[PDB]
Amino acid sequence: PKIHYRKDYKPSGFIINNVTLNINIHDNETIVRSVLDMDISKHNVGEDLVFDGVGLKINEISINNKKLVEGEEYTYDNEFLTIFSKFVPKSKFAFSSEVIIHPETNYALTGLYKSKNIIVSQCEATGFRRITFFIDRPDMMAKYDVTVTADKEKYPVLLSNGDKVNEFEIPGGRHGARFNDPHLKPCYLFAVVAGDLKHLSATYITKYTKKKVELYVFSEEKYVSKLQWALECLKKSMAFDEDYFGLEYDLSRLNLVAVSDFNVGAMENKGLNIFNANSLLASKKNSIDFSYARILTVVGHEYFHNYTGNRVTLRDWFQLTLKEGLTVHRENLFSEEMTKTVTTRLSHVDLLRSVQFLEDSSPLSHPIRPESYVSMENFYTTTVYDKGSEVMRMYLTILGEEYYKKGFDIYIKKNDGNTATCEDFNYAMEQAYKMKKADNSANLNQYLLWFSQSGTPHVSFKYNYDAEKKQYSIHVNQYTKPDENQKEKKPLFIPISVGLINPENGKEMISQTTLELTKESDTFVFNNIAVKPIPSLFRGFSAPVYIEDNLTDEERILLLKYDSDAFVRYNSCTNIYMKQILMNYNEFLKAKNEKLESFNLTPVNAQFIDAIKYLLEDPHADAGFKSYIVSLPQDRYIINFVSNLDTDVLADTKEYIYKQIGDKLNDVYYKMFKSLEAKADDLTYFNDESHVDFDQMNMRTLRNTLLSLLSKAQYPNILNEIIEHSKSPYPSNWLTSLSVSAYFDKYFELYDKTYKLSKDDELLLQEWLKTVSRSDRKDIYEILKKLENEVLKDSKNPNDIRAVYLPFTNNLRRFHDISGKGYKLIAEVITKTDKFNPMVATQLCEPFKLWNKLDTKRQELMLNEMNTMLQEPNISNNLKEYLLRLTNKL
Numbered sequence: 001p002k003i004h005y006r007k008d009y010k011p012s013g014f015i016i017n018n019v020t021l022n023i024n025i026h027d028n029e030t031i032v033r034s035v036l037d038m039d040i041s042k043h044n045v046g047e048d049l050v051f052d053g054v055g056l057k058i059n060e061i062s063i064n065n066k067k068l069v070e071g072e073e074y075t076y077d078n079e080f081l082t083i084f085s086k087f088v089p090k091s092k093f094a095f096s097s098e099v100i101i102h103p104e105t106n107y108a109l110t111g112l113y114k115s116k117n118i119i120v121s122q123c124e125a126t127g128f129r130r131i132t133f134f135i136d137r138p139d140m141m142a143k144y145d146v147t148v149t150a151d152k153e154k155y156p157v158l159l160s161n162g163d164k165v166n167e168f169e170i171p172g173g174r175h176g177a178r179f180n181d182p183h184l185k186p187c188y189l190f191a192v193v194a195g196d197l198k199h200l201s202a203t204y205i206t207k208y209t210k211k212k213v214e215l216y217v218f219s220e221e222k223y224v225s226k227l228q229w230a231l232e233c234l235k236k237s238m239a240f241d242e243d244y245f246g247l248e249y250d251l252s253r254l255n256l257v258a259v260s261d262f263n264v265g266a267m268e269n270k271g272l273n274i275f276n277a278n279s280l281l282a283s284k285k286n287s288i289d290f291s292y293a294r295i296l297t298v299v300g301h302e303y304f305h306n307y308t309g310n311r312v313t314l315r316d317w318f319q320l321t322l323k324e325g326l327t328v329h330r331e332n333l334f335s336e337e338m339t340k341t342v343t344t345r346l347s348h349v350d351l352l353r354s355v356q357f358l359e360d361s362s363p364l365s366h367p368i369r370p371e372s373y374v375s376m377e378n379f380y381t382t383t384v385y386d387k388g389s390e391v392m393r394m395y396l397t398i399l400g401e402e403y404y405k406k407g408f409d410i411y412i413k414k415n416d417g418n419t420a421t422c423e424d425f426n427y428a429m430e431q432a433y434k435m436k437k438a439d440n441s442a443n444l445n446q447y448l449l450w451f452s453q454s455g456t457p458h459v460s461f462k463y464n465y466d467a468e469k470k471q472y473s474i475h476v477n478q479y480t481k482p483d484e485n486q487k488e489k490k491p492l493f494i495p496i497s498v499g500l501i502n503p504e505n506g507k508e509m510i511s512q513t514t515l516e517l518t519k520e521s522d523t524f525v526f527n528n529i530a531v532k533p534i535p536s537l538f539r540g541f542s543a544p545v546y547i548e549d550n551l552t553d554e555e556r557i558l559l560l561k562y563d564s565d566a567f568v569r570y571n572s573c574t575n576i577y578m579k580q581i582l583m584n585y586n587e588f589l590k591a592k593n594e595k596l597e598s599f600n601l602t603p604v605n606a607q608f609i610d611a612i613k614y615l616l617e618d619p620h621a622d623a624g625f626k627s628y629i630v631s632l633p634q635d636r637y638i639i640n641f642v643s644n645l646d647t648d649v650l651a652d653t654k655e656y657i658y659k660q661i662g663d664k665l666n667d668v669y670y671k672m673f674k675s676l677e678a679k680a681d682d683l684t685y686f687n688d689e690s691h692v693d694f695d696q697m698n699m700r701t702l703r704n705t706l707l708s709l710l711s712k713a714q715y716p717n718i719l720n721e722i723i724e725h726s727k728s729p730y731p732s733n734w735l736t737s738l739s740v741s742a743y744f745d746k747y748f749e750l751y752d753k754t755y756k757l758s759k760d761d762e763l764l765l766q767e768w769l770k771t772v773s774r775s776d777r778k779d780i781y782e783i784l785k786k787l788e789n790e791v792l793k794d795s796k797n798p799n800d801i802r803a804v805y806l807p808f809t810n811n812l813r814r815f816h817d818i819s820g821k822g823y824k825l826i827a828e829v830i831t832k833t834d835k836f837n838p839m840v841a842t843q844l845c846e847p848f849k850l851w852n853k854l855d856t857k858r859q860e861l862m863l864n865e866m867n868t869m870l871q872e873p874n875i876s877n878n879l880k881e882y883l884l885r886l887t888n889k890l
């Protein structure tokens, strides 16, 4: 097996200074002519010249205008072109190749491919070698001169990176355009697009240098009207990087382009950012609310990469978190600032503690900077992205705003125009740390374990209060469970943001402070603490850890009601839920296994239910926050606290708990659903695509969450409220009417009516698919079969495939049916998908990640499907590696 190891990094024996491309697009072939002006590096030892080149049809190969010949001067095996050393010059030389490739048949959406009527590239991580020969690695930085030619009628818009320097006519209906990108870059940042594209545009003027930047956003003609929010989000993104980081854009022009077929969300190609349509295009009549947040965060992310990834790039792929973790951190800061809602941070935490914590206790567990890979693509993980973001955010929590900015500026300045490593970032943050502490002995060496050590720390707490001395102490322990990466886990540098609440009046007793736990355990003592406080721990979720608060439910309710920090309130709520869930889960489990004729369930705490009511009845409390409190923790969060999980028992647990709370609060839920309507569904800004009210959007989420609860409960006459809700002009509302209708005989009429409302917009139809897929229907398998036959059919669009199947995999009762039929269905889809799109196939494996956490029958059923997929002939390297790792074999 071909394993690359982080410690084996060596610079190349060659240098590529300039790339001159001619990309000639025709109906049934694309011809790529390439000149690399190359040199020998000081690390060269007379080795053969080896270029990556995958699936290329060679027309010609030369060095310095001398034709090289197969079997004599080179070999090519469809993956590497080797030029024997004897024929490799000893100093500056021009390597020329011409290859034929076929975007029209590239269903894998990596390299050059056709997405509906657009030709587009995706080069990160190893796609460039599918366009032409290269030493395809991020430390091989060069300048690019790129000409694209095509039929003019079919492809009137031609784009590549950088300044458009010439446009020309060509006989036979063709035309070309030449682009020069003056910044040194790795090949993974090359892009090209050709299409019948429409655009909206604006001019932006940089804050400090006053450079004029032309901003263009592009799509196919049909969706040109759905482009304006993206443009506004780009303007926001640029202003944020200038205002917070001092960072200005560095070309005269920046293009964003939407395409229908894209493996992930978007891509940061210099000057030419390429997006999945679902992360660039929206309109208020034709998109759900979540699209607006998605577009803001993705546009932001791709723009933030212009410094963190582009101007400072990676030495090698093991450094991925340096760009992605740090870009996600910058995106999240931007997103918090733009939205101004406490739910934006909560939603990042929620995603980490569910999806990423699951990954981190699975056999796929890896540190944010991995030690080895086979397929690069398997590293684009929530660990590398989201844990990485939290590691990058802790620097800000530790240093504070002004010292963080100073550290970041040192990082940017030192490494600008060059490659960088995670050590370079920590080194820069270390110089800021030295400054802040006044002290040159202080270092962040210990901080490096956030990059190397895998797994989630557990941070636990014990308290003492001496009421005569007015002295309170917090004793903190950390522990990380040993795993395959490290048999001994070292203590991390853990910042714990804290306050102290007076429990009789709900007020803050201290200035917020950040405890720095650097040992296995430590005791933190506070004086002049006038009464026994309740601690408010890990405010803002200050480190990526399992928190054990050792607080009573009564103390948690008090934080939930009175604490200032939205995370702590929410976490306190979450912990009360989890205690209840683990208690009722155990009771139901013992009932099943011991075959009991009768048994008891512990009821939901009645003071918690009262606190929920109190919060919900507070007209001045945040509506997004309220939607978090009435929903139980996610199943993927729960599963981290249970071994040998019986998923049907968990489903009975959640249902009892919701029913208990419902039986007390349903009238309060109904009353708030009705009284929220006027502000929730107010049409101010409905025709303005430059403006979104994120608070009002949260009112819609709350109303939609309540309706779901009332619907499942069969609250009297809720059906009329579902009917009226289907007539709202907000797609968030009318698609909600479909899924909550699942509990009624009206489902199938709403199905048809929302189908008709959705079917003429590609992205909205994809949302309708997802809504159908996640419907809480007994007959959900027959409904998937209907989606497959009537709507999905043989689509190779990843959005369509993921929309039909992924939401259903989160149906706890059905996906996990004890027959294994859900496991069998998704394995079939994975295997089918892998034959044309290995990346998407592995995304579709995600439900299998928790296999070894289930009850032993469901474990056996999942492993069987996984070993079956591993036996498929011509399984991709991507899927094989993933499944081998996930099944403890690699």
Ligand SMILES: CC(C)C[C@H](NC(=O)NCc1cccc(Cl)c1)C(=O)NO
Pocket: 124, 125, 263, 264, 265, 266, 267, 268, 301, 302, 305, 324, 380, 843
């Ligand atoms: C371009 C890629 C190499 C990776 C990455 N993009 C990204 O969209 N990750 C999110 C994602 C993942 C899976 C599915 C979907 Cl639908 C979306 C990124 O960082 N862009 O800047």
Ligand SMILES: [Mg+2]
Pocket: 054, 055, 056, 057, 100, 101, 102
């Ligand atoms: Mg080919």
Ligand SMILES: [Mg+2]
Pocket: 297, 331
């Ligand atoms: Mg995000």
Ligand SMILES: [Mg+2]
Pocket: 762, 797
């Ligand atoms: Mg389509």
Ligand SMILES: [Zn+2]
Pocket: 268, 301, 305, 323, 324, 327
């Ligand atoms: Zn990124």
